[PDB]
Structures are given as structure tokens and as C-alpha cells.
């Protein structure tokens, strides 16, 4: 029987290997994930920076819209006094 006891030892060492594989797998896949995750800080920072630069450009544009306005009404002024004489 001692016969059966052996048929169980073998039976169970083949479960150990089959299971150990399902571990190695999950272990590797978990690592890969950890590699992709360690980059989110960077994605964050980048989203952040871009928005920053955008804001910069929106103010640069803001100044010009303010210049355009100025020269616009300065042309208007000249025209008004050229229409005379």
C-alpha cells in the first residue's frame, strides 16, 4: 500500500511544479507591470510641464492681443486727423 503512499508523493510533486509555473508567470507579469508603473510619475510631470508651457504661450498671445489693440486704435487716431487738412 505503502504502494498508494508513493503514488501520492509523485502525484503531489507534479502539482508543485505545475503550481510553481503559475507563480513564475504571475511573478514575471507582476514585474513587467512594476516597470510600466514606475513611469506614471513621469507621465504626470510631463502632462504638468506641457500645461505649463501652454500657459506661457497663452500669456505671450495675451500681450500681443493687447499690442494689436493699441496699434489698432493708434491707426484710428491718425486716420481721424489725416481725414482733415
Amino acid at each position: 500500500s505503502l504502494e498508494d503512499l508513493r503514488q501520492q508523493l509523485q502525484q503531489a510533486e507534479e502539482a508543485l511544479v505545475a503550481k510553481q509555473e503559475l507563480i513564475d508567470k504571475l511573478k514575471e507579469e507582476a514585474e513587467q507591470h512594476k516597470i510600466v508603473m514606475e513611469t506614471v510619475p513621469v507621465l504626470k510631470a510631463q502632462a504638468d510641464i506641457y500645461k505649463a508651457d501652454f500657459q506661457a504661450e497663452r500669456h505671450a498671445r495675451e500681450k500681443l492681443v493687447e499690442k494689436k489693440e493699441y496699434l489698432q486704435e493708434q491707426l484710428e487716431q491718425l486716420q481721424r486727423e489725416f481725414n482733415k487738412l
Binding site: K51, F54, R58, R61, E62, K63, V65, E66, E69
Partner: protein, 148 residues
């Protein structure tokens, strides 16, 4: 047919829809609840951007399917406001935006309450009721704020 969307802040909102509407139809509904202008919002699923028109059925979207929303920085149309100090601030707007819609957004940047505000566009005074279209205000246009 009862789905949510989520900003990258975590902030979730439930949106009552059916598996027929278009991408813009969803976007249309978002603005209803949240007030977020449709063109300023991009939508993501299964790791890819969705395009207005193609209906939400197509992109395999199911019930309680979690969607991903992203707010842009620009908004397609913009206008300008010059303060009593001479400051120029750029507002993000749309044709159908009442003077109350504009007065709203001006309160956000400058702060000043929507009742100290009197907007003079090309000589004439603006009035809360009428939208941007009524006065025919094209983009890049510049409003003026003066004393009430």
C-alpha cells in the same frame, strides 16, 4: 445602459445613457450635468481615443463600463476681456453663451462679482439675456469691462 466616466483625479460621475448614442451624444450629455464644453473633452476606452460620431455600441461599451475623460487646455473658440486696469484675459467660450455665461467665466479669473460687470462691445452695452451670437461676436474678439 448606465455608465460612468472618470477624470484623472478620481472624481467619478454616473451618466444615464443607452447603448445607441454617438460619442458626441455622450459629450453632449456631460455638458448637461457637469457643464464641461463638448469640444474641451476627449474620451478614452480600452486604451484608445473615441471619435465623435461613431456610436458607443461599436467601441464595445457595456453597462457600468468605466469610461475615461480628459479635459483639454484649449476649447476651440476664445474671446478677450480688458479690465479697468488694462489687463487682458482670455476666456474660453462658444457661440451660444449668454452674457451671464461670459460674466460667469470672468468671475473665475478676475474674481469680481457678476454685478459690478458691464460689458461694452464696440460702443454698445451688453445685456445678460442675449447670447454671444445675438451680438455677433466672432472668436478672437475683445470685450471691455467698465464701471457700473
Amino acid at each position: 445602459m448606465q455608465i460612468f466616466v472618470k477624470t484623472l483625479t478620481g472624481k467619478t460621475i454616473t451618466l444615464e445613457v443607452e447603448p445607441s448614442d454617438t460619442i458626441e451624444n455622450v459629450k453632449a450629455k456631460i455638458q448637461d450635468k457637469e457643464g464641461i464644453p463638448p469640444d474641451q473633452q476627449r474620451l478614452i476606452f480600452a486604451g484608445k481615443q473615441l471619435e465623435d460620431g461613431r456610436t458607443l455600441s461599436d467601441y464595445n461599451i457595456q453597462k457600468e463600463s468605466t469610461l475615461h475623460l480628459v479635459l483639454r487646455l484649449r476649447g476651440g473658440m476664445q474671446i478677450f476681456v480688458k479690465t479697468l486696469t488694462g489687463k487682458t484675459i482670455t476666456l474660453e467660450v462658444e457661440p451660444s453663451d449668454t452674457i451671464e455665461n461670459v460674466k460667469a467665466k470672468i468671475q473665475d479669473k478676475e474674481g469680481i462679482p457678476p454685478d459690478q460687470q458691464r460689458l461694452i462691445f464696440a460702443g454698445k452695452q451688453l445685456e445678460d439675456g442675449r447670447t454671444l451670437s445675438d451680438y455677433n461676436i466672432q472668436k478672437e474678439s475683445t470685450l471691455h469691462l467698465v464701471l457700473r
